[PDB]
């Protein structure tokens, strides 16, 4: 996160760390959607141009964290992946279209003060909150500056959704229906962004109807971190929802 704040304890109990077994190392953020499933960006597992292609075991999930780096002895929980499911039509070749994957934990985790799943949107919740101007919230333990570093605690920032056309006009990349961008305008005089290490993290909204938190997006990609005239791009979780249900009453 660039231009964030330190999260408060228990502010994002669904936040999850993807942790490198060896070299032990922070891979990306993810989110807990049930006691056995985690959602992340397909590009934290499989990214062929960078030679990245992680397996169920080069991998470890860390839940209920606050500290980026400390083993948080009676708060965090660590699990093992039973399996990984990548969107069959994820496009690493040109723009990360469909940047989404599901991770099924070997054993379910138990909920607590620091661990609780985020809700997945319904077609009507999605309908009313996904509007240019509405803010959402991104959390991560990534880069604090485009290039220097890494924070000591979970960082947080609130950003506004931007209209598609401005989104498309900020870059040469081809934007699809499964993406949405976010951030302030150079003239809004407020700023902040997701950055390296934040990927696979959740972009969330609080529903004013039921007072519940909804995961609307997954941090996917950007072009620099916090540059004027650029925005962050997020997977549109509600558009990918059929794919989610399906892998869940399939292998769940």
């Amino acid at each position: 996160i660039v231009e964030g704040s330190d999260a408060e304890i228990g502010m994002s109990p669904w936040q999850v760390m993807l942790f490198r077994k060896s070299p032990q190392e922070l891979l990306c953020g993810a989110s807990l959607i049930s006691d056995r499933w985690v959602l992340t960006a397909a590009h934290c597992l499989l990214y062929p141009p960078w030679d990245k292609n992680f397996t169920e075991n080069d991998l470890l999930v860390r839940i209920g964290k606050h500290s980026r780096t400390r083993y948080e002895r009676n708060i965090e929980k660590i699990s093992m992946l039973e399996k990984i499911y990548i969107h069959p039509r994820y496009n690493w070749r040109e723009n990360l279209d469909r940047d989404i994957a599901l991770m099924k934990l070997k054993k379910p985790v138990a909920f607590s003060d620091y661990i609780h799943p985020v809700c997945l949107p319904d077609r009507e919740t999605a309908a009313s909150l996904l509007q240019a101007g509405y803010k959402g919230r991104v959390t991560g333990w990534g880069n604090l500056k485009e290039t220097w570093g890494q924070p000591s605690v979970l960082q947080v920032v609130n950003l506004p959704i931007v209209e598609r056309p401005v989104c498309k006009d900020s870059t040469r990349i081809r934007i699809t229906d499964n993406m949405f961008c976010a951030g302030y305008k150079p003239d809004e005089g407020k700023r902040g962004d997701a950055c390296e290490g934040d990927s696979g993290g959740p972009f969330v909204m609080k529903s004013p109807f039921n007072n519940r938190w909804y995961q609307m997006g997954i941090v996917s990609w950007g072009e620099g971190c916090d540059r004027d005239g650029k925005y962050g791009f997020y997977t549109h979780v509600f558009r990918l929802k059929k794919w989610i249900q399906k892998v869940i009453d399939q292998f769940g």
């Binding site: 609780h116 803010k135 519940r212």
Partner: peptide
């Protein structure tokens, strides 16, 4: 089931330091 209700905030009725910024943006 009880998704998106935070044990340390919604469940005890405590608001975090910046949710109001989001809620005020829902126009």
């Amino acid at each position: 089931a009880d998704c998106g209700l935070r044990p340390l905030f919604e469940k005890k009725s405590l608001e975090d330091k910046t949710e109001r910024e989001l809620l005020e943006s829902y126009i």
